[PDB]
């Protein structure tokens, strides 16, 4: 019984700075700046994008950490889980 996998999703909003999202992507998903920036733009232009796909526990930890980091820096940036 292989484990269910979960997609980590970033949702676009109009107030979180692009610089910040890029930072999030490097810090919590090990993206280099270039890939991070493109990914931020995929979110920005499409409204949402998949940052990664992980085992449930890993995914839920990423999500919780990304959101906490966002609120602590007073941004509304929303990270969510989706079952793959």
């Amino acid at each position: 019984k292989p484990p269910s996998m979960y997609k980590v999703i970033l949702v676009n909003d109009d107030y979180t700075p692009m610089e910040f999202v890029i930072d999030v992507l490097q810090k919590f998903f090990s993206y280099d700046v270039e890939r991070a920036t493109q990914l931020m733009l995929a979110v920005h232009y499409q409204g949402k994008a998949i940052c990664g796909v992980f085992t449930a526990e890993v995914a839920e930890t990423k999500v919780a950490m990304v959101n906490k980091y966002a609120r602590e820096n007073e941004h509304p940036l929303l990270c969510t889980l989706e079952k793959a």
């Binding site: 676009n12 109009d14 700075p17 692009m18 610089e19 999202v21 700046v33 733009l41 979110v43």
Partner: peptide, 10 residues
């Protein structure tokens, strides 16, 4: 998201 006027280099 919101740009701060910076260039993305991407």
């Amino acid at each position: 998201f919101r740009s701060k006027g910076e260039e993305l280099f991407t």
